[PDB]
Design an enzyme around this catalytic site. Structure first.
Site, PDB file in Angstrom:
ATOM      1  N   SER A  88      13.895   6.548   6.279  1.00 15.71           N
ATOM      2  CA  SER A  88      12.717   5.773   5.899  1.00 15.71           C
ATOM      3  C   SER A  88      13.222   4.418   5.422  1.00 15.71           C
ATOM      4  O   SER A  88      13.623   4.272   4.266  1.00 15.71           O
ATOM      5  CB  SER A  88      11.908   6.475   4.822  1.00 15.71           C
ATOM      6  OG  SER A  88      10.649   5.858   4.671  1.00 15.71           O
ATOM      7  N   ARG A  89      13.199   3.432   6.316  1.00 17.12           N
ATOM      8  CA  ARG A  89      13.771   2.135   5.989  1.00 17.12           C
ATOM      9  C   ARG A  89      13.125   1.532   4.752  1.00 17.12           C
ATOM     10  O   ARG A  89      13.773   0.776   4.024  1.00 17.12           O
ATOM     11  CB  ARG A  89      13.634   1.195   7.183  1.00 17.12           C
ATOM     12  CG  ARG A  89      14.758   1.335   8.184  1.00 17.12           C
ATOM     13  CD  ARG A  89      14.249   1.339   9.595  1.00 17.12           C
ATOM     14  NE  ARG A  89      15.305   1.059  10.556  1.00 17.12           N
ATOM     15  CZ  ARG A  89      15.218   1.306  11.858  1.00 17.12           C
ATOM     16  NH1 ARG A  89      14.121   1.839  12.368  1.00 17.12           N
ATOM     17  NH2 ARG A  89      16.232   1.019  12.652  1.00 17.12           N
ATOM     18  N   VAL A  90      11.859   1.846   4.492  1.00 14.86           N
ATOM     19  CA  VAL A  90      11.254   1.446   3.225  1.00 14.86           C
ATOM     20  C   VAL A  90      11.967   2.123   2.064  1.00 14.86           C
ATOM     21  O   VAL A  90      12.270   1.491   1.047  1.00 14.86           O
ATOM     22  CB  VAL A  90       9.750   1.761   3.230  1.00 14.86           C
ATOM     23  CG1 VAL A  90       9.203   1.734   1.825  1.00 14.86           C
ATOM     24  CG2 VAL A  90       9.023   0.764   4.105  1.00 14.86           C
TER      25      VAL A  90
END
Ligand SMILES: Nc1ncnc2c1ncn2[C@@H]1O[C@H](COP(=O)(O)OP(=O)(O)OP(=O)(O)O)[C@@H](O)[C@H]1O
Ligand SMILES: Nc1ncnc2c1ncn2[C@@H]1O[C@H](COP(=O)(O)OP(=O)(O)OP(=O)(O)O)[C@@H](O)[C@H]1O
Ligand SMILES: Nc1ncnc2c1ncn2[C@@H]1O[C@H](COP(=O)(O)OP(=O)(O)O)[C@@H](O)[C@H]1O
Ligand SMILES: [Mg+2]
Ligand SMILES: [Mg+2]
Ligand SMILES: [Mg+2]
Lengths: 47, 469, 188, 501, 486
Positions: free
Chosen positions: D371-373
């Protein structure tokens, strides 16, 4: 086709996982021994 | 002149003229649009027809609309006023702060420096990253590539490079984002504003953002690279000063051309790419260069479709870089970050004459020990590791220690790892790897080296692990 | 769409497709004969060296072509059908193959009035008495309304007899074919 | 080079000077209908991607504007169109209705109700093909979107305004992730915190109607339909409808985004929108590309997913999360369209079909799911527990193929893995997730048998939900786990453990 | 208007003008556009002509006027080019003035027939121990250098070019060798650094660098190898010896593919037209060795090919492997484990063989080849090492030393006699009692020692070209004495 070096890890098959697990086992054991030795050396060196 | 649209198919518009005909690469403005639509000419089909690629969505076009030939290729503002702004492919600002008021306009299409204009000096450019500085040292004025699959660290690494170098740079900088997430473009803009690199109030900005993010139709993603390149060209030539140029991604510049190629009426090449892939990329990558009248330290992130370094696009780009740092997914799976692949990143200044004898010997020693470890893993497959001789268990242990030590925590990754970002000057890296190779740290556990800066920090971390044991 | 009246003989390709359009246009209003006249007149007109060289150059605006053709069709007071057809060809850019068009129409007109074509190939000329009796017999092949349109021809390749073609039907009485048939049958 | 409109039926009109009688500006005639694509002669004033209306009520979307004809695509079955039919413009780029009226309706790709409950009383219409927000409107994803699935909320957190991607083989539980997410928001929607209400949209592309009907029944069962739209372009529907359904859904969600509300949209699957697009393009004689997919099948999805944004507070503060669902073939996540979409999104949930049999359901393949966030879009309490839990799982994952310390490590890892399993259509509040994760990660299950954790968790949850709801409310409102709350949890966990055996 | 000697562009785009007129234009003839741009007429069709533009089509509008120059493409030649940097047509691009060459040649001339040639017999010294001993290259050969990315191919080529300086600075005339380096599809700064590197070693007074870089239009990259091969045929046909290095020949194939696919010719495999064999075969077949009746000159060729992932069954790699007289594989696995040059000596071959080796290097490499062949078939044990008899133990203790003799450094080629001396020491057995890690040092020392004191012995080996038993004994004595004091 030919054979490279370290292709068992690349393939990722069962053999690659077996590599990574066995190597982690051995070096966990050695790291435990080295940490113990480091603590014991620390105690033997406070004097 | 003034033509009339005759056909619209996807992003390809055929326009018919009765006055003189506009030469190729010219920009034609479509009359009757709420927002400026610019068509770039790409072909002459005969009968005073020209095929064109629309720089913006072709929704709502009507056969027969009127189109005015601007008379020159896409011209963009340049000068020290574009610093701190954000620009379209066509140069119009997209950061909502009024027009970019410059004296200088530049055409985004221009020939490359002649062979008699090139520089031949090379001096290492310390970046503060152990792996990059040790195995594939960068160079001032050189072109640099970050070949990555998806989600390996290209963008985090290029943000780290921005933070490190652009902040400590005498000259200007440019960040042309070609066809990558808009979330990332906004994140970078706010990071710079909050880090002082960009300045909204006064004229003290050192970055000239340009954005062609992945919602732009292919005609636009295939040209914003040239726009950022034009801004950097100006800063290199007219200002007569050093420049940086980060591009992310440079694959989308090829992908967009592939997208429009079929409609342009061209037989597809090997893997669906346009037949003109190599030249459409050379005519761009040949303008990003140092010359006797300037210097550009270009860094470029490069998508590698499906981690396939034999794909035509990365395969062709490899020849246009002075230094490549192939990020790898396999290493990133081990948790080593940055994932740079030590046995695939190369450089042109990695010579005993340019970086020194000891640096070269250590870099080659690291590579050789890692390769030996790769060979040994095959045997460890079957034997187990208890059976390995005592000259090889040492090799495996040292190689694991070096793998861990190549990892480092960046200042832009504090959100993920939580650790504190570090910079490791060159001397620290060379000394630490010398010592790890020599055997001066066989008594510390390998996990002591994981995500630390200089070697002394690895020693301190080993001590802390022992104490807390 | 409208119900274009099918021409008697069907032609294909761009040539025959323009020709079918023109035939259906003229058939309505019953202007076939005069339309054919203006067509065979433009046949002579377009062969004019100045017009012939001007209409083959692709570097003159197509509007120039159309304007010149409108001039040359207003001068001759061609029926509106022929002027429209020539303007259509100029607009579409097919006037380069006009002679194929008008020619097709001629064919499409012959089949209208029954000029069922024929052809006779012999090793030598034919005496007018023999040719006339040949015409009389060939007339028997046709139907009522149709009229023979003979075309004599000479070739030396066929030795004796002759070869006759009546539209689709075809009879080869050459000595060449007979010799070949005898040689094959006897050999096999 | 024979033009399409160079038929005889047209050249005859031209020849005998009759074309002036008919309207060839706002009207046209079908030259040739076949395989769901019409060629139309006329419509000289028809816009690109404008909608047109045939003489039988069928609609179409003029895609190709060629010099002499127009390539129109029928939003229906062309059984009723005939050569010579009159096509009349509609005047407007194809647009779909939007509003809060659609909420709870099984609308069609074009905005026509297909649940039989009556017409949609919508007021405003949006063009399907609109540009996504710019660099300036957005801000960084900050709020959490509670999926209600332990593994996702723990190790793959998803924020509001973030484009995830549920990718995995066929029949591994992707729609199940989607429906758990839709059902979970019920607790927030039935509340007064108007800033936490999430409105869901489910776009069903190329799925048999029985599937969509069962899904709608499942949503009504949990009364999760009062805040859900379902844009259903099923398999029997013409290719253009399946190609447009995602954009209809995305515009219905851009509505809620542009009015300060928070929307979630779930395309299922996008690999079938790509197939519909390929069919359309190939039937317009557009040259193919890879695997026959049109040359621009990346842009097709990029321009759709880029609309999932998180507007700043000067633009209302709205939000549109997107959860595209892709289907790989044999785990070949390196195919063409899966690779196209994996680089367009920011994060990905990898459903592996052998984690699914080995026992792990949901099959989320942690380690490959990212989850790049990242933690930026997580709750403080969940941050606290997940920090330890993710690390412990990461260590256990490299010693899984098997001392005392490492034996304890494997025991703990198996405990956590049995804690990450879950039921189906039974999401949990964040407070309960953090409670059980804390119980398992502090070590209060290092002795209980593996096959019993699956039940322990269940029982344990009931106990808290029946005895110490005040603690859960405190954790939830406070957001973070306070020291007194930590001590209360410690007491509760030890007490239940002792009396559980 | 003239439509026989002149025509007018019907269309343009992507570099392929479609001209109307030019009825008398020959195939593969150089026409000139009104904008000072040249072009090559490739497709002659009934209705038009397909001209590939040597440059940018931005300057070629529709309706332009094209005039045929009346000649097939031709390039300057002579010793006036030596030391210059020319582009794909002979125009200087080093800014040192006009080339000033009297002669000219046609790029597309045909190769010498069957009778003019004579069997390759002279040795072309590359100055690299591995190449010169195990995969030798004669004069008149065509030895492919096939490898991956960054494995060291251009370095093999440049070491070869630099080595010839010892011969070109002498007075013997039939050992002088003139080098040509065709650089196809390379970043200009790479060629600039290469020219600087050649100048440093002073090897740029007998080198012609033909430059067809990435920015150059596809026809220039398709045409550069032929320009270079013509400038080399000039030296072949005048009793001189040449050495042309195409770098790479895969990028010429890519440029040709672009040209074809834009001219709309039937694609074929990997989209390569049907002439990507004819294209390369009719280029590499011009490396000959004329017999004395034709001058005795010669022209070697060292085409460089890049293989993606060591895949040598691809289209172009196999096309160029079935045309040439050998190949020098450069595997990266060996590159990173110390073996540099990374010449995999199992896959490398030279169908010419030892027919092109000096009698001394034959005498020594004949047995070195067998020793390494035996080592390569028990290499796997190397890890286990122990637990095996003295037979394989000695095999893989000799193999390791022999391998470590073949390591070499950037831009430092060795004279043939020195290679012979080193391999003699190593293979006769005066090194098996030495720790492998030190071997290199010994070499780098022993070499210098022999260079300083025993120059007379090296001169005798060089001139006699053979290890006479007197020289053999003297060399054994030298090796024994030095190895004693180490
Ligand atoms: N957490 C879970 N626990 C138990 N079973 C599950 C779980 N998730 C999914 N399943 C099972 O998987 C089956 C199909 O899953 P689902 O349809 O959600 O996957 P899918 O890939 O969307 O299917 P398809 O791709 O064929 O539409 C369901 O019948 C369900 O029983
Ligand atoms: N004999 C050698 N000894 C030590 N290093 C070498 C040797 N040969 C090559 N190298 C190293 O390998 C690197 C790449 O060399 P080179 O440019 O010759 O490969 P290449 O195949 O030409 O690369 P590319 O394919 O990118 O053109 C250089 O940096 C060089 O230092
Ligand atoms: N230096 C690092 N430290 C920790 N995690 C990292 C690092 N670099 C990358 N990652 C992880 O890998 C992911 C890769 O994302 P990113 O590199 O930003 O995009 P790209 O796909 O272009 O490489 C990040 O989201 C992050 O979670
Ligand atoms: Mg990125
Ligand atoms: Mg499903
Ligand atoms: Mg090279």
């Amino acid at each position: 086709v030919r054979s490279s070096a370290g292709a068992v890890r690349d393939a990722g098959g069962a053999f690659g996982k077996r590599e990574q697990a066995e190597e982690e086992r051995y070096f966990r054991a050695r790291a435990k021994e080295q940490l113990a030795a480091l603590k014991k050396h620390h105690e033997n060196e406070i004097s | 002149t003034t033509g009339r649209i005759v056909a619209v198919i996807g992003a390809v518009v055929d326009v018919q003229f009765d006055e003189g005909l506009p030469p190729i690469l010219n920009a034609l403005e479509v009359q009757g649009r709420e927002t400026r639509l610019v068509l770039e000419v790409a072909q002459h089909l005969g009968e005073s027809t020209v095929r064109t690629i629309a720089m913006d969505g072709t929704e709502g076009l009507v056969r027969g609309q009127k189109v005015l030939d601007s008379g020159a290729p896409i011209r963009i503002p340049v000068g020290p006023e574009t610093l701190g702004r954000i620009m379209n492919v066509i140069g119009e600002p997209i950061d909502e702060r009024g027009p970019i008021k410059t004296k200088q306009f530049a055409a985004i299409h221009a020939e490359a420096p002649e062979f008699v204009e090139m520089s031949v000096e090379q001096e290492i450019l310390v970046t503060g990253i152990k792996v990059v500085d040790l195995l594939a040292p960068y160079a001032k004025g050189g072109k640099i590539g970050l070949f990555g699959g998806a989600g390996v660290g290209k963008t985090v690494l290029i943000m780290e490079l921005i933070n490190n170098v652009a902040k400590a740079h005498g000259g200007y900088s440019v960040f042309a984002g070609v066809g990558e997430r808009t979330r990332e473009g906004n994140d970078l803009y706010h990071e710079m504003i909050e880090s002082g690199v960009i300045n909204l109030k006064d004229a003290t900005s050192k970055v000239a953002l340009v954005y062609g993010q992945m919602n732009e139709p292919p005609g636009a993603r295939a040209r914003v690279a040239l726009t950022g390149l034009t801004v950097a060209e100006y800063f290199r030539d007219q200002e007569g000063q050093d420049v940086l140029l980060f591009i992310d991604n440079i694959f989308r510049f090829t992908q967009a051309g592939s997208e429009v190629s079929a409609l342009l009426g061209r037989i597809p090449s090997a893997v669906g790419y346009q037949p003109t892939l190599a030249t459409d990329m050379g005519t761009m990558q040949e303008r990003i260069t140092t010359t006797k009248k300037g210097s550009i330290t270009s860094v470029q992130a490069i998508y590698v479709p499906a981690d396939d370094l034999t794909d035509p696009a990365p395969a062709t780009t490899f020849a246009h870089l002075d230094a490549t740092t192939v990020l790898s997914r396999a290493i990133a799976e081990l948790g080593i970050y940055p994932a740079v692949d030590p046995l695939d990143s190369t450089s042109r200044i990695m010579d005993p004459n340019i970086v020194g004898s000891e640096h070269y010997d250590v870099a080659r020693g690291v590579q050789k020990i890692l390769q030996d470890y790769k060979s040994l893993q095959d045997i460890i497959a079957i034997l187990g590791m208890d059976e390995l001789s005592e000259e090889d268990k040492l090799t495996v242990s040292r190689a694991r220690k070096i793998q861990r030590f190549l990892s480092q925590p960046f200042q832009v990754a504090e959100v993920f790892t939580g650790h504190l970002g570090k910079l490791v000057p060159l001397k620290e890296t060379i000394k630490g790897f010398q010592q790890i190779l020599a055997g001066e740290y066989d008594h510390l556990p390998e996990q002591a080296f994981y995500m630390v800066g200089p070697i002394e920090e690895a020693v301190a971390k080993a001590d802390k692990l022992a104490e807390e044991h | 769409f409208a119900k274009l009246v099918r021409p008697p003989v069907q032609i294909y390709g761009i040539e025959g497709r323009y020709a079918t359009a023109l035939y259906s246009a003229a058939s309505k209003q019953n202007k076939l004969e005069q339309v054919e006249k203006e067509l065979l007149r433009v046949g002579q007109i377009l062969k004019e060296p100045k017009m012939a060289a001007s209409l083959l150059n692709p570097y003159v605006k197509r509007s120039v072509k159309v304007k010149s053709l409108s001039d040359m069709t207003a001068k001759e007071k061609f029926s509106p059908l022929t002027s429209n057809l020539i303007n259509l060809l100029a607009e579409n850019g097919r006037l380069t193959n006009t002679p194929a068009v008008i020619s097709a129409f001629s064919t499409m007109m012959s089949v209208h009035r029954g000029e069922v074509p024929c052809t006779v190939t012999t090793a030598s000329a034919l005496d007018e008495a023999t040719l006339t009796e040949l015409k009389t017999v060939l007339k028997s092949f046709l139907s009522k309304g149709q009229v023979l349109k003979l075309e004599v021809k000479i070739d030396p390749s066929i030795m004796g007899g002759m070869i006759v073609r009546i539209g689709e039907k075809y009879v080869d009485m050459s000595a060449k074919t007979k010799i070949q048939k005898l040689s094959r049958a006897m050999r096999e | 080079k024979t033009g399409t409109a160079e038929v005889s039926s047209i050249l005859e009109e031209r020849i005998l000077g009759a074309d002036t009688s008919v309207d060839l500006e706002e009207t046209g005639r079908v030259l040739s209908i076949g395989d769901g694509i019409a060629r139309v002669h006329g419509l000289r004033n028809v816009q690109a991607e404008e909608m047109v209306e045939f003489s039988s009520g069928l609609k179409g979307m003029s895609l190709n504007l060629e010099p002499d004809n127009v390539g129109v695509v029928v939003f229906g079955n062309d059984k009723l169109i005939k050569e010579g039919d009159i096509v009349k413009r509609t005047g407007a780029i194809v647009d779909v209705p939007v509003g809060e009226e659609l909420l709870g309706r099984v609308v069609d790709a074009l905005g026509n109700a297909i649940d039989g409950k009556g017409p949609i009383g919508s007021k405003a219409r949006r063009r399907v093909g609109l540009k996504a927000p710019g660099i300036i409107p957005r801000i960084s994803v900050r709020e959490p979107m509670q999926t209600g699935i332990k593994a996702v909320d723990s190790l793959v957190p998803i924020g509001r305004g973030q484009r995830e991607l549920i990718i995995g083989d066929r029949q591994t539980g992707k729609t199940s992730i989607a429906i758990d997410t839709i059902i979970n928001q019920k607790r927030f929607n039935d509340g007064t915190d108007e800033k936490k209400k999430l409105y869901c949209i489910y776009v069903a592309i190329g799925q048999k109607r029985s599937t969509v009907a069962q899904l709608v029944k499942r949503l009504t069962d949990a009364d999760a339909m009062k805040y859900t739209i379902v844009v259903s372009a099923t398999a029997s529907d013409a290719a253009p409808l399946q190609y447009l359904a995602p954009y209809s859904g995305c515009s219905m969600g851009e509505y809620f985004r542009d009015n300060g509300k928070h929307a979630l949209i779930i395309y299922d699957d996008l690999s079938k929108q790509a197939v519909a697009y390929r069919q359309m393009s190939l039937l317009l004689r557009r040259p193919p590309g890879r695997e026959a997919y049109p040359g621009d099948v990346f842009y097709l999805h990029s321009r759709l997913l880029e609309r999932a944004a998180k507007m700043n507070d000067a633009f209302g503060g709205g939000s549109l999360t997107a959860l595209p669902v892709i289907e790989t073939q044999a785990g070949d996540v390196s195919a063409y369209i899966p690779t196209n979409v994996i680089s367009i999104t920011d994060g990905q949930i990898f459903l592996e079909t052998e984690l699914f049999y080995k026992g792990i359901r949901p099959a989320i393949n942690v380690g490959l799911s990212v989850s790049r966030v990242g933690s930026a879009a997580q709750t403080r309490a969940m941050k606290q527990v997940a920090g330890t839990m993710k690390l412990e799982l990461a260590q256990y994952r490299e010693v899984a193929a098997f001392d005392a310390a490492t034996q304890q490590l494997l025991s703990r890892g198996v405990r956590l893995t049995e804690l990450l399993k879950q039921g189906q259509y039974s999401p949990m509040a964040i407070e309960e997730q953090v409670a059980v994760i804390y119980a398992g990660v502090r070590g209060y299950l290092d002795k209980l048998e593996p096959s019993k954790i699956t039940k322990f968790e269940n029982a344990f949850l009931s106990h808290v939900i029946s005895q110490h709801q005040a603690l859960l409310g405190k954790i939830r409102t406070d957001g973070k786990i306070s020291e007194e709350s930590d001590a209360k949890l410690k007491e509760i966990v030890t007490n239940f453990l002792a009396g559980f055996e």
